[PDB]
């Protein structure tokens, strides 16, 4: 299969997952997308410490099991998240320290893993353990103050609790190889493998944005860690702006690393994101696939003028007009700026540099024209592998009116049909 993300990833033995929030499982639009596109699930918050052990010694798995059950019943594996870390600790744990905190950490690991023993593919045993101060050292926390060996102990405890689960160390800002934080974690994992500390994977959260941007060296980081003898996983992927190129780049980085188990994006729709303002996911709030979705799917499936297949003519702005509202047409291909389209990372098809291929509405017959670029979804398009070009907002295909092939044939939106008047080639 190759029409959905999970299935496409499965072609190479990998998974494509998402973060599931129990409070959204009653939302049909949400579950329809989530069940269809992903074959791996991480509970966004339901398996954290405060959620699983609200009171010291009092475990509660109602929320966690709801997410776990939904996952398995819908054919998805599960990544446990998270057994031991400084954030979101229940009140009682926040006030603990020293030996008592160390034992509390151990009891928690045993309780949660015991409950899910043998049913979890991967567990984020420890997360957010390193600082962002640039020293590459451990971050100051109550857990770290119990002893620098707390992480090692967590892993040994986890291995004994459930030998069937892959144990991962998870963190953010450890994707760029040149960063001190990345080196700090690398050195720790290397030390662990050399001394026999039970660690099977390293999770790279991959929360990319202009403050901490994706860099091509992420692939090198993944390869360097894989060379240590551990699997790697992209665990909480989201990209500020959802650039199609960046999303495809990260996807290809995992495909380039034999031990990269798969990729999990942190949420289903942008409206479900912990950082919705960065519109960092693959689906819009209205459920429509973003340009980045198609870029990722194309990558998972193994991978200028825009010429119509049925007509042999090019997408053309009549008389090189730059006027907003000018409907586009088919016209004999020739060297002219009004036939030069640029596909951007935002999914736009630009002409003249700042004009955008624009749908004047959402239904069949809608006029496709040029309008100054502003970022609307009616100006975003998905370039499908079959040659069709689909509008993000409308879900409709660019269509040469009535199957016309002569110069002057207008372009409109129309239900996709795989017809030759809806197929295009670029060069």
**Residues annotated as part of the active site:** 236
User: Which residue in the block uniquely carries the two structure tokens 């699930």?
Assistant: 41
Measured in degrees and rounded to the nearest 5, phi and psi for residue 125 equal -70, -45
The answer to whether the annotation marks 399 as part of a ligand binding site is: yes
327 is in an annotated binding site: no
Tokens 């954030």 appear where? 87
Do the annotations mark residue 240 as ligand-binding? no
Give the contacts of 414 (CB within 8 A, at least 6 positions apart).
Answer: 364, 365, 396, 397, 399, 422
Q: Does 338 count as an annotated binding residue? A: yes
Q: Cα–Cα distance between 395 and 416 in angstroms, integer? A: 8
Q: Is 332 annotated as a binding residue?
A: no
Whole-angstrom distance, CA of residue 93 vs CA of residue 112: 16
* Kind plus residue range of the DSSP H or E element containing 342: strand 342-343
Residue 303 CB neighbour total at 10 angstroms? 9
Burial class (CB in 10 A: 0-12, 13-18, 19+), 3: exposed
Extract the tokens encoding 216. Answer: 């091509």
Rounded to a whole number, what is the distance in angstroms from the first to the last CA of the chain? 28
Q: Is 224 one of the annotated binding-site residues?
A: no
Q: How far apart are CA 291 and CA 242, in angstroms?
A: 8
Helix axes 218-226, 244-255, angle to 10 degrees: 20
Rounded Cα distance, 99 and 146, in Å = 7
Residue 38 is given by DSSP the state -
116 CA to centre of own chain: 26
Known binding residue 404? Answer is no
Q: How far apart are CA 406 and CA 391, in angstroms?
A: 24
Partners of 202 in the β-ladder: 169, 232
Q: Which CA distances in Å does 366 have to 8, 327, 373, 394, 401?
A: 32, 10, 18, 10, 10
Asked if residue 13 belongs to a known ligand binding site, the reply is no
| Residues in the annotated binding site | 316, 319, 329, 334, 338, 399-400, 402-403, 421
| Residues in the annotated binding site for beta-D-galactose | 316, 319, 329, 334, 338, 399-400, 402-403, 421
């Amino acid at each position: 299969a190759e029409s959905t993300l999970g299935a496409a990833a499965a072609q190479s033995g990998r998974y494509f997952g998402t973060a599931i929030a129990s409070g959204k499982l009653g939302d049909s639009a949400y579950t329809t997308i989530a069940s269809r596109e992903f074959n791996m699930v991480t509970a966004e918050n339901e398996m954290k410490i405060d959620a699983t052990e609200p009171q010291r010694g009092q475990f509660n798995f109602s929320a966690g099991d709801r997410v776990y059950n939904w996952a398995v019943q819908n054919g998805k594996q599960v990544r446990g998240h998270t057994l031991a870390w400084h954030s979101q600790q229940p009140g009682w744990m926040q006030s603990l320290s020293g030996s008592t905190l160390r034992q509390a950490m151990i009891d928690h690991i045993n309780g949660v893993m015991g409950h899910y023993k043998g049913k979890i593919a991967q567990w984020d045993v420890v997360s957010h353990a390193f600082s962002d101060d640039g020293s590459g050292g451990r971050r100051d926390s109550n857990l770290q103050r119990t002893g620098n060996d707390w992480i090692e102990v967590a892993f040994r405890t986890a291995r004994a609790a459930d030998p069937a689960a892959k144990l991962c160390y998870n963190d953010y800002n450890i994707e760029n190889w040149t960063w001190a934080k990345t080196q700090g974690v690398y050195n720790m994992v290397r030390d662990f493998k050399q001394r026999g500390v039970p660690i099977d994977c390293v999770g790279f959260q991959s929360h990319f944005n202009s403050g901490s941007p994706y860099n091509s060296n992420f692939r090198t980081t993944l390869q360097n860690f894989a060379a240590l003898g551990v699997d790697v996983a992209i665990t909480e992927l989201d990209i500020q702006g959802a650039s199609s190129s960046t999303y495809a780049a990260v996807t290809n980085d995992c495909l380039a690393v034999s031990r990269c188990l798969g990729i999990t994006v942190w949420g289903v729709r942008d409206t479900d994101s912990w950082r919705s303002g960065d519109t960092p996911l693959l689906f819009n709030g209205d459920g429509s696939k973003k340009a980045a979705y198609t870029a990722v799917l194309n990558a998972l499936n193994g991978g200028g003028q825009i010429k119509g297949v049925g007509s042999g003519r090019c997408l053309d702005v009549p008389n090189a007009s730059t006027t907003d509202g000018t409907q586009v047409q088919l016209y004999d291909c020739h060297s002219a700026t009004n036939q030069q389209w640029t596909y951007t990372d935002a999914g736009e098809l630009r002409v003249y540099g700042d004009k955008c291929l624009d749908a004047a509405g959402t239904g069949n017959g809608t006029k496709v024209q040029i309008y100054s670029c502003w970022g609307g979804d009616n100006q975003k398009w998905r370039l499908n592998s079959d040659g069709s070009i689909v509008g993000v907002q409308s879900g409709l295909c660019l269509d040469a009116v009535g199957g016309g092939t002569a110069n002057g044939t207008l372009i409109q939106l129309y239900s996709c049909s795989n017809g030759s008047n809806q197929r295009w080639t670029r060069t």
